[PDB]
Amino acid sequence: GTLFEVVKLGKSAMQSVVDDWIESYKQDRDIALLDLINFFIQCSGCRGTVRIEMFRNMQNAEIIRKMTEEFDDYPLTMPGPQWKKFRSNFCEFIGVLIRQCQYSIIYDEYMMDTVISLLTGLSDSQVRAFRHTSTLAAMKLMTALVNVALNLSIHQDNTQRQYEAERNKMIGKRANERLELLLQKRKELQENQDEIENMMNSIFKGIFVHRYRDAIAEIRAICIEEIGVWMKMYSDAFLNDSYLKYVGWTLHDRQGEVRLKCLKALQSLYTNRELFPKLELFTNRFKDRIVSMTLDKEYDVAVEAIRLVTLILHG
Ligand SMILES: CC(=O)N1CCN(CCCc2ccccc2)CC1
Question: Where is each SCD domain found?
Fold first, then answer.
């Protein structure tokens, strides 16, 4: 509308184009997912694009096979001013997309399963471009879903409090309307969180557990940085000795870049004098490695290790 109306509503190109995409999904899911599929393809630097006859009538693996061939250095490795903000933007895009899809489209059983199936397939690819792009996307995707779970978690607690104050209000009395609605709200929200947890598991078992050991250091670096983000954000699901073994196993990684990340992640855990109890077995297991890394070889790795150890000392 008015210039004042658009300035007082900082909808950016991204949010604008996510809002357009959401509207295009409501008309025709197929073409919208087609456009979203082609987006991930184009972000890898792949020169081909999928048509609706392929999307409808080929099995993912086949689509990936055909896009593999059409591959002339990709947008994420590009240097120069016209790609400085690409990574940053690509990551924000995934966050905006899912933030916006989080209350309806995400729980449709078509949109997330389509994306995660693509990202999983692109993460198994011989092409570096594909492995790098999909994995980074999947790591930002997991974090987006974690933020969805945290939002349910709040709503689950308001619906929990509201049911308690209505179960108690009644007692001895026939279960009225507010009490059947709330007892329904509560199941719906938990069935939402199942579905989130599910997608998280598909992303973790399918993409993470394979990529965190990847040939390329940047891909190992992306996986570690993010498991560290999940473990801080959502302690109860991700902060456990099974998931932590991935971070420990990686402390022994060959690359400064990567060792640096494991320590940065563990740092942010140990600062919280609270999940400190839940790091007790992990610390006993890798004190020898954490501590050994204070004289690492790479100065800036060693610095971090020393900082980590001082943090472990203080608790
Ligand atoms: C039932 C069926 O045959 N379909 C087509 C293939 N599926 C592909 C959609 C996601 C995807 C992943 C990897 C490459 C391309 C596309 C969607 C449904």
Answer: 208-293
